[PDB]
Structures are given as C-alpha cells and as structure tokens.
Structure 1
Amino acid sequence: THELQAMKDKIKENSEKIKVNKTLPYLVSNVIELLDVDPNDSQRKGKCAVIKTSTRQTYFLPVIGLVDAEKLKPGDLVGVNKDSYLILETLPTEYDSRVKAMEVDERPTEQYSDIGGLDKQIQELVEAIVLPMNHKEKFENLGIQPPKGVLMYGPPGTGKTLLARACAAQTKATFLKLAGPQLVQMFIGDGAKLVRDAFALAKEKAPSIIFIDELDAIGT
C-alpha cells in the first residue's frame, strides 16, 4: 500500500526530465486533431494528429504528449521544441498584437455630469448601457431584451465622444477605443478579420463596452 509513494518519486524525477524538454516551448505549431488506425501490413494502433508549422511547412507527429486530446478542438499557439516536434502544453490566447487588444483604456477623467441641458437625451443613452447590467434580473421576469447598438449623431461639436466614454467611468465598464477608418490597411483582409477577433472577445468578455466613430462614412 506504500508503493504509491515509491513510484511517486520516479515520476517526479522523470518529470524533471520533462522540464529540460519544457525549456523552451520553442515555436508555434497549428494543431489539427485526427484519429486513424493503420492495418499492418503485428497490428499497430494509436492516435496520431497531423500538425502544422507557421513556417509554411506541415509535419506529422503522434498525439501529445503531454496534454491529452481532452483539449482541444484543433488549435494553434502551442509550444513545440526545435526539430524534435513535440508539444508540451496547449497555450492560449488567440492573436495578434493590436488585433487582440485594439486600445487599452482605463477610465476617462470626466463624468456624465459634464453635459448641460442634455439631461433629456442622456437618459436614453444611459439606459441602454446601464440597464443590461444591474436591471438584467428584472428582464428575465418581464421578457425584456436590452438594446445593443445606438446611433449617436449631431453636428460637431455635439460633445458625443466625451459623453459616451464618460458614462463608462461610473459604471466600471472597461472601455476599448476603436475607429472606423482604422480598419483599413494596405493588406486586404485585416479589419475584416478583426471583428472575428473583436466579437470573439465580446463573447469571452462581459461588458464593459465598445465605442466606434464615423459609422456613416464606412457604411457607404
């Protein structure tokens, strides 16, 4: 019954042999999970998943080893060491650089109290953003659906951008700065892939908020 502690020493000693193989997860390899058996021609059975490499080459390696097939659907970002082509751990999260996080904004120096005479039309604004957070419990009872998009337009200066961001200061909402024309680059397929990343974070993250400007021009 005490043999469990005896083998516990050799698995940690051999886990140290994994440590030198875990430094470092040298490169990124796109993962594709596959299950196939090859009759020979005695019998050799096993699970083997075809792997990619971002170098544009594609390779073939058995299923990892270490982290099992429980995670995940075919991925990327995982670390693998030089030409040995073994993946030690499945590493998140997604990509890339400014595409992942467009802008990091803590909170504005101003608050919604900075607008005079607009108290009539700020209530419509403040509602749609605030109501899905605190009042969500009342919506499941009455079957209420919170608004999503809001069109805020007026001849400049209307103080629209100051009023928008200022409402995220008191509500603790994390702000993300984004502009419409910022999605256009020389390389085609950039701003288009951004929403695939942006709205994926909208599913991952809780509002918070996202604000954009010049929707009319980009919607031409």
Structure 2
Amino acid sequence: EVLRVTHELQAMKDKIKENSEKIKVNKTLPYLVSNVIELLDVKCAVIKTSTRQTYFLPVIGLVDAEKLKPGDLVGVNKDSYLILETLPTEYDSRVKAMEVDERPTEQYSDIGGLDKQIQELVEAIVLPMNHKEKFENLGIQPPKGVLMYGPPGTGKTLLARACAAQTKATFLKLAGPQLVQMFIGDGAKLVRDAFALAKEKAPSIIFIDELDAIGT
C-alpha cells in the first residue's frame, strides 16, 4: 500500500509542478505597481493603479486574502490588472535617509533663554519616552506630539535637534518643505512609511519642520 501512496505522491507532485509552471509562465514581467485602496467582501479588491486609473478586481489573484491590507503597494498585470505579487515596502531609501544620526549636539548649554520651553518639551517628551512606567501608573496620558509655533529665528529647529540630542532617540526628521512631491501618492507614502519606520525602531521622535508646506 505504501507504493500506492508513493504513486499518488508522484502524480500530485507532477500536477503541482505543471500548475506551478503555468503560474510562473503567467507571472513574467513587468508588473503595474498599484496601491490597493480597500477590500470589499461582497475576495475582491478595488485597486487604483499608478496610471491614475482604478480597476475593480472580481478575484484578488495570485495572492492570499488576509495578507492584503488597505494601502498595500502591490504589483499587478498591466492588462488584466490582477494582483500577481505583493511588493515589499522596506520604507524605500529616502525614508531611511531621514534617521540622521550625526546630530550636531545642541546641548542645553548651546541654547540660552529658552529654559522654560526646554523644560516644557522635556515634560512632554523624554520622560514620557524614558521613564514611562510611572507615566502609565499615574494615568497621565503623555501628549504624542508638540507643535513649535513662534516667530522665525526663535530656534524651533534648534531646540528640536536639542531634545533629539541629549535625550537619545533616533530623530526621524520629516521636514515639511520636503513633503511635497509632484509624483502623486509619494508624500503621503512618505509620511506613512516614516511612521511605520518609527514603529520599527527603538524609542524615537518624528520631527517635521515647517509644517505649513502641507498644513495649509
């Protein structure tokens, strides 16, 4: 009987081989890099291709359902517009270029007069990031962010690098005037990848200078 099981194994092995060869010869290249907007239930997703055209898919294609999530950047066929392979993100390379670790060391000795503001930032961050156990125990929710408003030349960028300097962290700087790209869906992808990268790394701070570029 073991020979019968072996024969079934070999037959289904060559069946797997032929279906795999069909899949491989239907994969080929190129793929249309498309961004899945959402996933409707009634195994079918609404894709917006990089060609600025949306195409509903009756079936998802050569991928598995729960792996796909709203916002996933995948590669689809140029004609049938069907998901072929999920494309890894890797946070591009520009996003990883903004984790700058040559912090010019704005020690609080290099910033004068902005003392109470330094202490207010260190009350809003640092201790929430460093000594967080007591912060959970108290029930004081630490504000996730601070907005540095002030007349130009006040030193907002300086104190930002300062509290990025003497308080460790990764300092993923995400300055606003950078976050405007004539390519559609690049700035938004930049922000989402920056936050995903901040999730990936150790305790860090996302810093956005001149928010008016996108904050209008």
The TM tier, using the shorter chain, reads: 0.5 to 0.7
User: Which consecutive residues of structure 1, in runs of 5 or more, have no partner in the other structure?
Assistant: 38-46
Shift of 1:165: 0.6
Alpha carbon RMSD of aligned pairs, Å? 5.1
Q: Deviations over 1:140-187 (max 9, x none)?
A: 211112134445567775544323213213444232445566668999
Counterparts of 1:198 and 1:102 in 2: how far apart (Å)? Answer: 9
Aligned-pair identity in percent equals: 100
Q: TM-score normalized by structure 2?
A: 0.60
Given that 2:179 and 2:214 are in contact with CA atoms closer than 8 Å, whether structure 1 keeps it comes out as: no
Tell me which protein shows more strand as a share of its residues: 2
Whether the 8 Å contact between 1:77 and 1:94 is mirrored in structure 2 is: no
After superposition, give the CA deviation of every residue in 1:115-134 in whole Å (9 maximum; x if it has no partner): 46766653332232112222
Residue 53, structure 1, aligned to residue 44, structure 2: no
- Structure 1 residues 81 and 174 mapped into 2: Cα distance closer, same or farther (>3 Å)? same
Q: In structure 1, the residue corresponding to 2:14 is in which secondary structure?
A: helix
**Aligned residues of 1:29 and 1:77 also touching (Cα < 8 A):** yes
- 1:210 Cα deviation after fit: 3.0
Q: What SS does the aligned partner of 1:89 have?
A: strand
Please say if residues 106 and 174 of structure 1, whose CA atoms lie closer than 8 Å, have aligned partners that are also in contact: no
Distance 2:139 2:175 in 1: 34
Structure 2 gaps of 5+ residues are 1-5
TM-score (norm 1): 0.59
CA contact (8 A) 2:126 2:167 kept: yes
Gap change, CA 1:103 and 1:204, over 3 Å in 2: closer
Shift of 1:72: 3.2
- Going from structure 1 to structure 2, the CA distance change for 1:89 and 1:184 (only over 3 Å counts) comes to closer
Paired residues of 2:176 and 2:211 also in contact (CA < 8 A):
yes
